[PDB]
């Protein structure tokens, strides 16, 4: 009854369209993944960790800087 | 000043950024006694970083305390309140007082068969400890000297210093089910004596504070090892009067700990008693009750 | 001989030692830390080198050297196998160790150099042992939180050299036995260099040149001749082609970084191409991911 | 409902070991078995607790060890990944970004003016 | 934003790697 007998062409068919289906469900997953929330709040506190660290040490090296051009000035 | 008068200030300063590089400091002499009178001061004064602060300086808080060290400790109008000395009134006048009154050891120790209840023996009520209290009032060292200072912490309710001294020493989950039913029942004789209701209203709070930490440290342990948190809930709790974590939780009436499913799973075992069966229950047991010959087609175990 | 009790320091530790003469049968060591210290044969060796000096970096650059050395030592069960007194890149290994903690530890250190000599006296006995460092007197106090020790005399008082020729032949002497995987290797002994000086690059040049090629890893965001390795390494094309701009920036902080004068930055840099030759070797972790990536890929590499 | 069943739970307790404890001969034959009580009582006169030793108990002290310090290591780390303190260390370093980078523009801005002065000369 | 705040802030800071460059060669200079 239910037991559409099937030949091989409209098999081959019917395994694209549920690989793509399979592609496309785990695609709509890791894309529900990365704009949830959660995962937001993480990237954006764990790049605000870099930011801190990175912008403290263009604050120190500038120091370097200031001290360095003004020794240049000194010298002119 | 010298380092002796500088702490005095400093613990009555507060500042765990000031000792911590300061007051002891690579170079400092300390002198004898004065770290030991420290933390007779600091324990009064509920030094929570403080006492911890020592303990990193390397007070040996097993050599530190002795038996009149505790006494002493017992013995100070300072911190927070006490209901210690509401209940060694109640204590005294079931056994048989000016603001002199001697909290005696065993008086703890007789607030402890009041409050906790039931059998439990407190270890001050041993006769040994009973004649070193009339021949001492390394005898004053004691074996496990963490165990006496939780039973400190939780008596006059200083519950900052009652989570410190739980992560530190040992029967972890005796210890959370101990306080948990002392607390629970200094949460009854608050209301007894009629004291200030709000002291119940935390202390109700700090007993089921208690009773969640035995039971995020019973399923922290279960699936860590399953086999031997048996051996932790069973064996034999020499320290807290001879006793066991499941006799310990249904004397707190802790409910959830009961239900866990570590300590259920131990009570279907001994149910079924000394059986391995565990299919078919009830109906085939019956079968062993009135017909002898089918107990020889049981699997028993060993 | 005996066990050292820590009073201090954090947390009460037990790290038991022995004093050692400098020119000892490292056989002998060999029966000592797998009998009388009973020690396990790991399957790595860190040879954690850099300068004398304390020093500070950046905090990530810590909080990363911190976890992946360690991090190392748990995927490894490794031996990490350090310069024992607590100064600079050692007190870094134990802000690292301190950092987890929760292993198998070795310090050797000079006992002409360590504080509180006559204190440190005994016959398999427990001894207490203070963290107390005075800065007044230039005796320096070994690194606390290790479990395995050996304070080793030369005589003399406030000098180094006399521990490296036997750190130097206790390792090659570990590496000589047949590790516990037994295919045809020692233990890969593998060489961290966080920052370190003039000498290190000598002793990456006793590392380097040897059999088997000690495979060395060096750290970068660090200081000194890790920086100028770094600058040999990231401008290095086919290897030792490197032209004179970052040359004489690099002779300036040799002669700034390292206050070398004119010549001493010529002959350094003499030694320096000597050493940028070999390139393969050497593996460069760069701040930018631990030094567990470092450690391991230096690890299959030397591993052979 | 919802309080009794786990409140059978807990009276699970109480039930095992009243039984446990209770004389296992039977309840209407206990004529014979006060007396096996009474005999048993007189007759020595005349004449679940697992009691571990110190090898297990040591074995048990160090796991219960790892138990409690893997349990205040694990609180931490729900409290610093969870979305509440994430906010908080979030916004509390972007109060120190903006006056590390307010150090930035004003002080580079005096370093523009110093490349100009520079400029005084060659 | 702070996307690109990461891109900004790495080009700042290897730009400013190429500033030290310009200033010891300005201290080769004097």
């Not at chain 3, 990530?60 to 024992?84: D, E, P, R, Y």
């Amino acid at each position: 009854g239910l037991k559409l007998f099937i030949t091989d062409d409209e098999l081959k068919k019917v395994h694209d369209f549920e690989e793509q289906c399979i592609e496309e469900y785990f695609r709509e997953k890791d894309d529900r993944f990365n704009s949830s929330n959660d995962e937001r709040i993480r990237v954006t506190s764990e790049r605000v960790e870099n930011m801190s660290m990175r912008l403290e040490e263009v604050n120190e090296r500038e120091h370097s800087m200031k001290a360095s051009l003004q020794t240049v000035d000194i010298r002119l | 000043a010298s380092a002796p008068d500088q702490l005095s200030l400093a613990l009555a300063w507060n500042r765990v950024d000031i000792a911590r590089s300061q007051i002891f400091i690579y170079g400092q002499q300390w002198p004898v006694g004065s770290l030991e009178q420290a933390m007779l001061d600091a324990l009064v004064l509920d030094r929570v970083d403080f006492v911890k602060l020592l303990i990193e300086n390397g007070v040996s808080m097993h050599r530190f305390l002795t038996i009149s060290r505790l006494e002493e400790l017992y013995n100070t109008r300072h911190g927070p309140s006490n209901t210690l000395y509401h209940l060694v009134r109640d204590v005294k006048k079931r056994e048989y007082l000016p603001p002199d009154y001697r909290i005696s050891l065993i008086d703890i120790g007789l607030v402890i068969e009041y409050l906790m209840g039931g059998a439990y023996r407190c270890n001050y009520t041993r006769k040994r400890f009973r004649t070193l209290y009339h021949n001492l009032f390394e005898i004053n060292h004691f074996p496990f000297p963490f165990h006496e200072l939780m039973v400190w912490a939780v008596l006059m309710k200083r519950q900052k210093m009652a989570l410190f001294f739980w992560q530190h020493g040992e029967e972890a989950m005796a210890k959370a089910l101990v306080a948990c039913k002392l607390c629970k029942a200094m949460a009854h004789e608050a209301s007894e004596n009629d004291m200030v209701d709000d002291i119940s209203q935390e202390l109700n709070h700090n007993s089921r504070d208690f009773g969640q930490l035995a039971v995020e440290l019973l399923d922290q342990s279960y699936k860590q090892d399953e086999q031997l948190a048996m051996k932790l809930l069973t064996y034999e709790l020499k320290n807290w009067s001879n006793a066991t974590c499941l006799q310990l939780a249904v004397a707190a009436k802790h409910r959830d700990f009961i239900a866990h499913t570590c300590s259920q799973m131990l009570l279907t075992d001994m149910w079924m008693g000394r059986l391995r069966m565990r299919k078919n229950s009830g109906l085939k047991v019956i079968l062993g009750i009135l017909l002898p010959p089918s107990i020889l087609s049981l699997e028993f175990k060993n | 001989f005996g066990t050292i009790e820590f009073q201090g320091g954090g947390h009460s530790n037990k790290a038991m030692y022995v004093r050692v003469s400098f020119d000892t049968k490292p056989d002998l060591l060999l029966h000592l830390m797998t009998k009388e210290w009973q020690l396990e044969l790991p399957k790595l060796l860190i040879s954690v080198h850099g300068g004398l000096q304390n020093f500070e970096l950046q905090p990530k650059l810590k909080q990363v050297f911190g976890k992946g050395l360690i991090k190392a030592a748990m995927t490894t069960g490794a031996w990490i196998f350090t310069g024992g007194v607590n100064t600079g890149v050692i007190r870094h290994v134990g802000d690292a160790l301190k950092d987890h903690a929760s292993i198998c530890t070795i310090g050797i250190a000079p006992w002409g150099i360590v504080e509180n000599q006559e204190d440190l006296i005994g016959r398999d006995v427990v001894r207490p042992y203070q963290t107390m460092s005075n800065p007044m007197s230039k005796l320096t106090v070994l690194n606390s939180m290790h479990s395995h020790f050996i304070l080793a005399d030369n005589g003399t008082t406030g000098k180094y050299g006399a521990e490296v020729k036997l750190r130097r032949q206790l390792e090659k002497h570990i590496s000589l036995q047949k590790i516990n995987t037994r295919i045809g290797q020692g233990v890969p002994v593998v060489a961290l260099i966080v920052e370190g000086g003039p000498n290190v690059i000598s002793i990456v040049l006793e590392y380097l040149r040897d059999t088997p090629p000690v495979p060395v890893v060096v750290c970068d965001g660090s200081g000194r001749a890790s920086d100028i390795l770094a600058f040999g390494h990231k401008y290095s094309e086919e290897g030792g082609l490197i032209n004179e701009s970052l040359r004489d920036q690099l002779l300036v902080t040799i002669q700034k970084t390292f206050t070398y004068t004119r010549t001493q930055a010529q002959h350094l840099f003499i030694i320096l191409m000597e050493c940028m030759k070999k390139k393969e070797l050497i593996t460069v972790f760069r701040m930018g991911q631990d030094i567990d990536l470092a450690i391991l890929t230096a690890l299959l590499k030397g591993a052979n | 409902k919802s309080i009794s069943n786990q409140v059978w739970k807990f009276q699970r307790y109480q039930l095992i070991m009243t039984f446990h404890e209770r004389p296992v001969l039977p309840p209407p034959l206990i004529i014979f078995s006060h007396m096996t009580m009474i005999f048993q009582h007189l007759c020595c006169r005349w004449r679940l607790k697992l009691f571990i030793t110190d090898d297990e108990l040591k074995k048990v002290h160090d796991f219960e060890e790892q138990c409690i310090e893997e349990y205040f290591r694990e609180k931490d780390d729900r409290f610093n990944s969870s979305n509440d303190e994430r906010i908080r260390v979030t916004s509390e370093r972007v109060e120190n970004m903006s006056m590390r980078l307010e150090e930035v523009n004003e002080r580079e801005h005096s370093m523009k003016a110093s490349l100009q002065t520079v400029d005084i000369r060659l």
